[PDB]
Design a protein around this ligand. Structure first.
Ligand code: MG
Ligand code: MG
Ligand code: MG
Ligand code: MG
Ligand code: MG
Ligand code: MG
Ligand code: MG
Ligand code: MG
Ligand code: MG
Ligand code: MG
Ligand code: MG
Ligand code: MG
Ligand code: MG
Ligand code: MG
Ligand code: MG
Ligand code: MG
Ligand code: MG
Ligand code: MG
Ligand code: MG
Ligand code: MG
Ligand code: MG
Ligand code: MG
Ligand code: MG
Ligand code: MG
Ligand code: MG
Ligand code: MG
Ligand code: MG
Ligand code: MG
Ligand code: MG
Ligand code: ZN
Lengths: 159, 117, 105, 202
RNA sequence: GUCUACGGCCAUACCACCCUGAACGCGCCCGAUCUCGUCUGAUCUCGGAAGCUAAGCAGGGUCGGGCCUGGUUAGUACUUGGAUGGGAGACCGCCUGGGAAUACCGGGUGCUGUAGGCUU
RNA sequence: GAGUUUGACUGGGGCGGUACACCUGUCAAACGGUAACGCAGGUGUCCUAAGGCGAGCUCAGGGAGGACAGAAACCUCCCGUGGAGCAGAAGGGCAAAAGCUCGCUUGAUCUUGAUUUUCAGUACGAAUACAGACCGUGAAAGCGGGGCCUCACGAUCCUUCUGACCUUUUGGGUUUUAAGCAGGAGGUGUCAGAAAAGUUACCACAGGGAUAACUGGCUUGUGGCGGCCAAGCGUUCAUAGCGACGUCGCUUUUUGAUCCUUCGAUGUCGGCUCUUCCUAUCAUUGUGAAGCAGAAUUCACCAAGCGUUGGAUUGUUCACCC
RNA sequence: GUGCUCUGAAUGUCAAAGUGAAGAAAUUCAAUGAAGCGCGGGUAAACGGCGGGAGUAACUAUGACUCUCUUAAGGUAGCC
RNA sequence: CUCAACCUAUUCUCAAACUUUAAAUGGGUAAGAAGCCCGGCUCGCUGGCGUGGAGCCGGGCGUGGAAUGCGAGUGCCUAG
């Protein structure tokens, strides 16, 4: 059936958000990117140079190369039955950083300071995180008053 | 007429030359322009059917052409609308209405608005 | 399209932008002693009829247009082929179009 | 001529309105959607009775016009000519196709329009005085006989063709939160300009 | 408590109308010799400092319009997974999880970076 | 007279189309991918500017005015988030822009590699980041190696031109010639690229129920036969008999739609002959109704026991007449 | 139109061979111009082919008649 | 004044090729020793600068930095 054009099906994803058109804000240009860090790929449509393909929109890769206006990114793409690492040159209006890796790095530094304080003070403290334990038996005060009696309503047809 | 021809000749004149040429045009109009030549933005104008009456002497080569005058009127501080750096709009009570345009005209040229009709 | 009879581009011999005069490339006439022509005559001699394909379909309607650029320097006057896209009507140094003139009655 | 409506009873084809892409559509049979005395104000006709579907299906414009006609005739010869106002609440925006009298190139051509109705959805409404309620119910039943599915007749808890209930209606009118205009009413919220309150509340 | 210059986020900052503005400032303003531009020193460019907050600008206001953020709408609509559930079908109910959006009703209405001023 | 060819896809083939190389929106089920002779359209071009910079402006539309001038000619002011324009299809994008008007130019130039898109992670085409020259523009930062983005195009072999004070041209040397190396062009639209008209009822072979021409089967648009509502017709009177606008069905005695079975064969129209079944009853038996006085007729019910003919014309089934 | 045929005169195109010129030669160029084709006639008991629209007569209808685009001719005498 | 147009505030009903809003299910990435933190050295890139960035040589840090399950990686040849 359909064409193999490079922007087929990108009516909404390469568009701008509502009341967000016009001039690109300059913080997106004055971010910095060192080779090795994790970036999200979105791909706005105000800029037509260096824009990523629709398979790479909404993806996440790491930077391997920095140039004047663009960045080489290593992204995992799933061709039919294998995952392979593609190397795409994308511009900085189309990328942004990754708060997931940022959060991981700050809990790494927190772990390191916590292990240092535990070692100097002579205790053993918890460093891992545990998945949401059960709910720790407790008392529920009624505060003297009786719990309110709920009761299903009769049926009435409005709409 | 077809497009990109030449149809009109116009000119913009401001200052002492403007007020004296406007004086000559109202001398031709005997300081009478009747009801509704005043636009709602406080500008006005009229037409002259023959120019030789005032001023310059007729030349046999030159024709008999008429013309029209449009005076757009202002107030000190109106240049902020066409200033390049930090442009603004002029503000509501700094505008020129039809009433104050007529009042200024008859005060500065003791003319007559609102004739017998 | 309409390209002017002179322009200023890179000349590989002097390694420098230079003025070039621009003509249109015309295919030369066949050599009769080129090796494929020799082989074709050798194959076509005798009996057997036509021994190579003869195309006879002709789907295209235009050609890519080749400009011969000659460097105007009197010592180095090297040439260079340069090709542009397809065009039905090609013009070499026509009259430049202007934007304000009265067009048309 | 026209196929039996059982060939187009069910919604199965992804709404198809007449637009740029669907050209050459004949006119629907229902052209008049309001009928009776359409200029009675808000309180001449306080009672509203709806005929509301209970099936997901599409009704033809021919069936809509037939039901409108027979309900109008019963209301005219029962409640008088100017004693009621009826609105059908269903416009036939969905175009149905027909294939020509094999299956090669089989995409059909527009032959009609139907209105797709949902489970809870009003098909027709009649507003009348409070004493013609049985006449409204009988008219809506006799109009219910013109449709394929199953429909129910229900008297609304609201005042006429408005969205406000009959018990809180006159109190809102008296405290001027609800100002009558035409067939309906306007709601006055207490957050406009005070000069609007002043040209009102006075 | 504010303002200039350059900004960042880009309406809680916009728009409409009304009130107030000490001191610096920002402007309006005066002029065309030079620089430079025009049909026109109106715009742009240049040279000033008699007057002025009228205007821009700032702050505040409006049962303001927009915008932002909540409530309601509503555990509604929709939906993951399940059944030898119902129903002639159309569709619907239940089990297991997730869960909206108008109308309507509140509250808010620019924060802030660097440098340099004024405010006894 | 000889030899050969006489595309493919296809709700059988043919005819018609191109779904055969591409592009936009949808389908498409909120990553991507996703079919049909699905839907709505476009392409084989156009452009020395409509390419590249820089500067300065604001567009469509509306309101109010101004001699001829009016709905439209030109001038002015105000409102105007773009409702205009950007070559073309559509989608996206864009406002001191990417639009419009000027100024200067040729980054539409010469080169090596990398990448993306289709993808087999092959090629072409298209594109994206760089790098090395030489330039353009701008005060400059910068921007620019074509067109704001998504389409606008083409291998081997052969030919042709361009480049290398280049290599080879066979025992050596000189000179023509030829071959070579690198880069463009001449084209394969069946667009990964044979060089190609029919007919066969005189036909043939290998096959095919992967595929048409019967029956059967699913379906029931169409045909046929029923029902519900009642606006009317019936002098009156909806319903004796009817039933418009609508709507619910049944049947497989019509014709389609489909291609499941059969192409190492199920004998292919009609009549004749002969049996049996059905009932949606024309007659006859027993009834009910009437706009049933009688006679005749009409509408229903139980009912298929019994009967339903002789001819003219046509191969006819149907038909029409005696 | 397609065939077939006739005329060749000044006459376009038209191969091999021959002639001249350039070059060191291969080679190149030029002049020269057979049939045929083209140009010009003929030929249908050669193959074949042989038109539309309007309005027009004391009822009405038709159309002797006319006006029209019109091709190489527009189907004649007959026959259905 | 009847009607219009027009404007304003409401109202009925819609959209595969409309949309401010906007799910459920879904797609990608991360959840450490290839990590962290100290010194020093190289650079022809970058530059107001001892800069910035990249590379390299040493040194010290193990609570192995969610759950659950599981032995993995890797090459050749290859049928249908
Ligand atoms: Mg498709
Ligand atoms: Mg498509
Ligand atoms: Mg580009
Ligand atoms: Mg369908
Ligand atoms: Mg508000
Ligand atoms: Mg639940
Ligand atoms: Mg998708
Ligand atoms: Mg999906
Ligand atoms: Mg610009
Ligand atoms: Mg430069
Ligand atoms: Mg470069
Ligand atoms: Mg070669
Ligand atoms: Mg192919
Ligand atoms: Mg089969
Ligand atoms: Mg049927
Ligand atoms: Mg039928
Ligand atoms: Mg009657
Ligand atoms: Mg079959
Ligand atoms: Mg099948
Ligand atoms: Mg068979
Ligand atoms: Mg057999
Ligand atoms: Mg047999
Ligand atoms: Mg048998
Ligand atoms: Mg019976
Ligand atoms: Mg018997
Ligand atoms: Mg001859
Ligand atoms: Mg003759
Ligand atoms: Mg005859
Ligand atoms: Mg006959
Ligand atoms: Zn040169």
């Amino acid at each position: 059936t359909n064409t193999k054009g490079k922007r087929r099906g990108t009516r909404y994803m390469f568009s701008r958000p509502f009341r967000k058109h016009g001039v690109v804000p300059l913080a997106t240009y004055m971010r910095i990117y060192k080779k090795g860090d994790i970036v999200d790929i979105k791909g706005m449509g105000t800029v037509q140079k260096g824009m990523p393909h629709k398979c790479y929109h909404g993806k996440t890769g790491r930077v391997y190369n920095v140039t004047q206006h663009a960045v080489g990114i290593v992204v995992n793409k799933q061709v039919k039955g294998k995952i392979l690492a593609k190397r795409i040159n994308v511009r900085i209006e189309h990328i942004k950083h990754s708060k997931s890796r940022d959060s991981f790095l700050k809990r790494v530094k927190e772990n390191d300071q916590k292990k240092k304080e535990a070692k100097e003070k002579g205790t053993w403290v918890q460093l891992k995180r545990q998945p949401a334990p059960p709910r720790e038996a407790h008392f529920v005060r009624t505060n003297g008053k009786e719990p309110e009696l709920l009761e299903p309503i009769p049926y009435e047809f409005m709409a | 007429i077809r497009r990109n021809e030449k149809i009109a000749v116009h000119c913009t004149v401001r200052g002492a030359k403007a007020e004296e040429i406007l004086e000559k045009g109202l001398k031709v109009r005997e300081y009478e322009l009747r009801k509704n030549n005043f636009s709602d933005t406080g500008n006005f104008g009229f037409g002259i059917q023959e120019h030789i009456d005032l001023g310059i002497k007729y030349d046999p080569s030159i024709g008999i052409y008429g013309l029209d005058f449009y005076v757009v009127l202002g107030r000190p501080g109106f240049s902020i609308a066409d200033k390049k750096r930090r442009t603004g709009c002029i503000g509501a009570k700094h505008r020129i209405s039809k009433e104050e345009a007529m009042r200024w005209f008859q005060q500065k040229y003791d003319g007559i608005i609102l004739p017998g009709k | 399209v309409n390209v002017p009879k002179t322009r200023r581009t890179f000349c590989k011999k002097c390694g420098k932008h230079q003025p070039h005069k621009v003509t249109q490339y015309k295919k030369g006439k066949d050599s009769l002693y080129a090796q494929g022509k020799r082989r074709y005559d050798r194959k076509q001699s005798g009996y057997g009829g036509q021994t190579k394909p003869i195309f006879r379909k002709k789907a295209k309607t235009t050609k890519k247009i080749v400009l011969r650029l000659e460097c105007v320097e009197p010592n180095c006057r090297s040439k260079r082929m340069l090709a542009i896209k397809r065009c039905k009507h090609f013009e070499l140094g026509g009259d430049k179009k202007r934007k304000g003139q009265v067009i048309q009655f | 001529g026209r196929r039996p409506a059982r060939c187009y009873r069910y919604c199965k084809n992804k709404p198809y309105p007449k637009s740029r892409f669907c050209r050459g559509v004949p006119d629907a049979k229902i052209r008049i959607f309001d009928l009776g005395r359409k200029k009675a104000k808000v309180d001449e006709f306080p009672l509203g009775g709806h005929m509301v579907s209970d099936e997901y299906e599409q009704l033809s414009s021919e069936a809509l016009e037939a039901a409108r006609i027979c309900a109008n005739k019963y209301m005219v010869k029962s409640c008088g000519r100017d004693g009621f106002h009826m609105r059908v609440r269903l416009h036939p925006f969905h175009v149905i196709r027909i294939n020509k009298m094999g299956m090669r190139g089989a995409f059909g051509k527009p032959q009609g329009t139907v209105a797709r109705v949902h489970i809870g959805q009003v098909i027709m409404s009649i507003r009348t005085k409070l004493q013609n309620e049985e006449h409204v119910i009988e008219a809506l039943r006799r109009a219910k006989f013109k449709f394929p599915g199953r429909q129910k007749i229900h008297i609304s808890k609201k005042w006429g063709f408005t969205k406000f209930n009959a018990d809180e209606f006159e109190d809102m009118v008296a405290k001027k939160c609800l100002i009558p205009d035409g067939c309906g009413v306007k709601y006055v919220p207490s957050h406009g300009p005070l000069d609007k309150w002043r040209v009102l509340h006075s």
